[PDB]
Structure formats: structure tokens, C-alpha cells
């Protein structure tokens, strides 16, 4: 079955879990196809077994740094001949953030992974990272269409590159995706020709919950992100999660933004509970590598503080690790995974209506809006309870207590920010 694993760190596990070497080092691996925002080629290529025949690497022109001669050795020169680069030219202010691995093995097997780390030593080892692992898939003729496969192919098409069409999509097409028949592949693309991002995700959730009646249940919506974008509007404080996404998902608004005070009453009246997990200032003090992982966490609110105060004090949206539940070896180190999830009710989040794990951070550029398309490539997997084989809920557990559908790096429960003391981490330095 598909499984979430916590990526091992050279620092936190020194002497359940996965490493890049488990993914790439297997002697039966024949081919890997990789997508990422950043590759450190000498670090990445050292993960592979000599048996590998091809490594196809997709990334933005310039995010694939060649190995300098001084860092070459015998082994690397051999693996390097097996590398095919597909270099993407992005529009301005657009990023290729998708992290995706498609592996093909000796006996026609295939396995797909979504790691939260870029392929660099620093990303892999500093902030907490996770990796979703598909079940084993087999090359073979397909029966009924599998949504995950259809969406993955739309997504690949949306690069509009002949090399992707020929070298990747054709190979994906041969794979039977039946073991993924419960899951959805949810993505963003700048392609004008393919709907994606928030509008498509919203339409997908509306379709997946069709018929479901309303309840007096509390409605919990949680986001864990390593970036929090600024206001959707220059004239008003409006946050993507609280003002647009949650209101869409709950039915507060439809596609054809509400005043903040109206939203707060609506949340109170519908028992909506919003959460954003983002590191506090003090959680770096109780992290083993201290502020080392802090550069991955971006929420630059100092220039428009009222937007932050609104989130912190009016929506009371911020949540932090339970310092009693974290391991000694990881402490309160923040995670660079992105999860979005919904629970309808301490035990909160252990049974979910749905959960999306993705590269997409909480920004307009990753998700778009109702009217604007995403600027980035992003990809993720969605578990939806109505899509499960059995009439059941998606189950979730925290890695900090280490089978469930989902596993998250944050504690369960998470703890509200203490309004007297806690503040989201934000550093303004001279260089930025």
C-alpha cells in the first residue's frame, strides 16, 4: 500500500524512516525520472547503484549545478554518462517546485515518490522532511481509467515539451496504476490550457463530497506550510487560507471575498476552526540544529503587521508543536512538508474527511485564485474518505509517537500559539 515515511537526517539519526539511498540505491533500479526545484548533482548521484541505466532529470534551466572537475571521481563520471537533462524555461516569477520521483525496476515494476526535500544535502538533513511512497505498480495493460494516472498525464502534458512527452509520459502510459485507484494526483501548472491549482482542487472536493448532508459538527481545516504569502489584496488584509480557501471549501462563498468581520462571525456560527502550523521564534531555541533550519521558513510580515495580527489574534489561526510529544533527537525542528487537511468532529485529525500532501506552499503563486491561474508547477497526492474502497475515514498519525493512511511530522495534537508570548518566526536581514 502507499505509505508516508519520515526522511532520515545525518544529524538527527546519527549511529518508519527512509533515505534517498533506500530510494535510489536498490540494485534492481533500472531508471529514475526526477522532478525538483533544486539538484546538487554530486550529492544526488552518490545515492544511485552502479546498475542504474538512465537518470532523466527535469528542472528549471540553472537549478541543476554541474559537478566541478575538482569534485569529480571515477564513480561519478560513470553515473554522469547516464544522466539526461530536460531543462525548463519558466516565465518570470514562476517556479518549478514539483518534487517527484518515478522509478522503473528490472522486472517491469514501477514506484512513485513525493519527497518534500529538494535533492541537496542541506535540504535533506536540516528541516524535517517526509516522503510519500506509492504502492508497487507493474507495467501492464490497463483496465478502468485510474484518476491518479489521468491527472498525472494531464500534468506531464502541461509542460508542452516534446522531451517530456517522449521520454517520460510514454513510459508512464505503460504502467498499470490500479493500486492507486483510491488516490488523486493534485497539481498546479502555469499552462493556460489545463485547469489546476485551487480552482481545480475546489471543483474536485465539491465533486467528491456531492450528496453529503450538513451537520452541527465542528469543522477543522489545517494547513502546515513552510511559506505563508502576504495579503491577496493591497487595500485589505486577506489571507489565502482564512479568506479564500476555507470559505470556498465550507460553502461560505462560491465562484460566480468577504469582509473579515463577516468571516469571523461565519466561522463562529458554522463552528469552523482554522489552523496554520508554522514555527515560532522560540521553537528554534529547542531545535537541535538551532536556527540552522530557519532559512526554509518564510513569512515576511514585518512590513504589513496588521495582516499578521489579524491571523494571530482575530482568527487565532497559529499552532505549534506539542513540546512534550516531540523526540529528543528532532526537538521542535519545523518540517518543510506541506499538508492541507480537513477533520469533522486531542483526537482531532486522527480520522480525516480529506488530506492533501503537496509541494504547494500557502501562496497565490502556487495555488492561484478563483480568477488567476497558478504561476508554479506543484504536485501532491490527495486522500479523500469518499474515495476509499470501504465507507471509511482517512486515518492519520504523527511520526512523533512512532498503520494509517497518512503520517505527519507535526505532533498530534498541535497546540495553539500562546497569545501572550508566541510569534511566528520572521527575520529581516540586510540582504533581503
Swiss-Prot record:
Keyword Cell division: no
GO terms under cellular component: mitochondrion; nucleus
Main location: nucleus
Molecular function terms, GO-annotated: 3'-tyrosyl-DNA phosphodiesterase activity; 5'-tyrosyl-DNA phosphodiesterase activity; double-stranded DNA binding; exonuclease activity; single-stranded DNA binding
Site (Interaction with DNA): 363
Region spans: Interaction with DNA: 227-231
Family (UniProt): Belongs to the tyrosyl-DNA phosphodiesterase family.
Protein name in UniProt: Tyrosyl-DNA phosphodiesterase 1
GN (gene name): TDP1
Covered range of the whole protein: 79 to 539 of 544
